[PDB]
Design a protein around this ligand. Structure first.
Ligand SMILES: COC(=O)c1cc2occc2[nH]1
Lengths: 103, 137, 87
């Protein structure tokens, strides 16, 4: 089954899908094809929890019925600059304005 | 043009509302006039006595947004070899879906009090209606 | 393969090229692998990208289609963006 994801780091958000049976490492290979950073320079997170390369997305709680096309689940991403990994930072999206009086 | 055929051959059908909307079934009578039938709650079904060659369409009962039935706009009962009429949401355009949400929140008097380009005024006011949809022959 | 859609506040959204060409307006802005939207903020453009995924997933599927959700607080700006992008 497909899971639909947003892979997010700083002000970067990748929309992609993957199989529930695919692994965390295989997701880093997807990120590599896009952002040109190898897996060993990547850390993937579910919220604050660091994800292990060998685990499947399903074991890490990304399930077809929670990681939905219209409401995808977020995978945090942090890079190794050269030595040491940056801390995980995800910039929030902008805030909507106040609801107009007619609403 | 869009007219039920007066076949007088019974055809038993189940309306199956596989959508989150309250569904208004609409029978097109022998003169082409839309005739509303009792509404269907979301996720509910109903056994209906209809006729071969009759014509039905389905709408959101509150807003008249268009719905699909067996993945098309019209349902025509056929020969019973009962017929299943699977009523579903279409994939609305993002624009039509936003118009749906804005219409659900703003009174029609107050469409003009919203800060948007004027062509969007007319889109909001041009709400769905079977009467416009029937014209396209 | 992928294109980059950049919001007015500088968020960069990376989506499959096929999903972005759903919008005729985006196809014209691309034809570059990068489009800047001076008028569309990230809380709107992220929703646009989720609509692409939803549309591609559920078009021509005879299963049950869920409703596309739109929070009230973003609906007006999302409508403007959808109107402009012809989405
Ligand atoms: C907050 O502003 C928007 O969401 C917006 C995008 C767009 O495109 C043409 C007009 C317009 N407005």
């Amino acid at each position: 089954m497909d899971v639909f994801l947003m892979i997010r780091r700083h002000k970067t958000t990748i929309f992609t899908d993957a199989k529930e049976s695919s692994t965390v490492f295989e997701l880093k290979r997807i990120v590599e094809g896009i952002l040109k950073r190898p897996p060993d320079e990547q850390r993937l997170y579910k919220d604050d929890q660091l994800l292990d390369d060998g685990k499947t997305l399903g074991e890490c709680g990304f399930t077809s019925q929670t990681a939905r096309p219209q409401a995808p689940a977020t995978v945090g991403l942090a890079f190794r600059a050269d030595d040491t990994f940056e801390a995980l930072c995800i910039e929030p999206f902008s805030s909507p304005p106040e609801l107009p009086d007619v609403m | 043009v869009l007219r039920s055929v007066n076949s007088r051959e019974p055809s038993q059908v189940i309306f199956c509302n596989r959508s989150p909307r309250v569904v208004l079934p609409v029978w097109l009578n022998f003169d082409g006039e839309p005739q509303p039938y009792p509404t269907l709650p979301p996720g509910t079904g109903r056994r209906i006595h209809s006729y071969r060659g009759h014509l039905w369409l389905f709408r959101d009962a509150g807003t008249h947004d268009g719905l699909l039935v067996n993945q098309t706009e019209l349902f025509v009962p056929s020969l019973n070899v009962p017929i299943f009429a699977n009523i579903t949401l279409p994939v609305y355009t993002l624009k039509e879906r936003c118009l749906q949400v804005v219409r659900s929140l703003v009174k029609p008097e107050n469409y003009r009090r919203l800060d948007i380009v004027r062509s969007l005024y007319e889109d909001l006011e041009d709400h769905p209606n079977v009467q416009k949809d029937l014209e396209r022959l | 393969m992928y294109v980059k859609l950049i919001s007015s506040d500088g968020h960069e959204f990376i989506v499959k090229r096929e999903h972005a060409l759903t919008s005729g307006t985006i196809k014209a802005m691309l034809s570059t692998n990068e489009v800047n939207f001076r008028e569309i903020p990230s809380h709107v453009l992220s929703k646009v990208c989720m609509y692409f995924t939803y549309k591609v997933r559920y078009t021509n599927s005879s299963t049950e289609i869920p409703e596309f959700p739109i929070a009230p607080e973003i609906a007006l700006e999302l409508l403007m963006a959808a109107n402009f992008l012809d989405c």
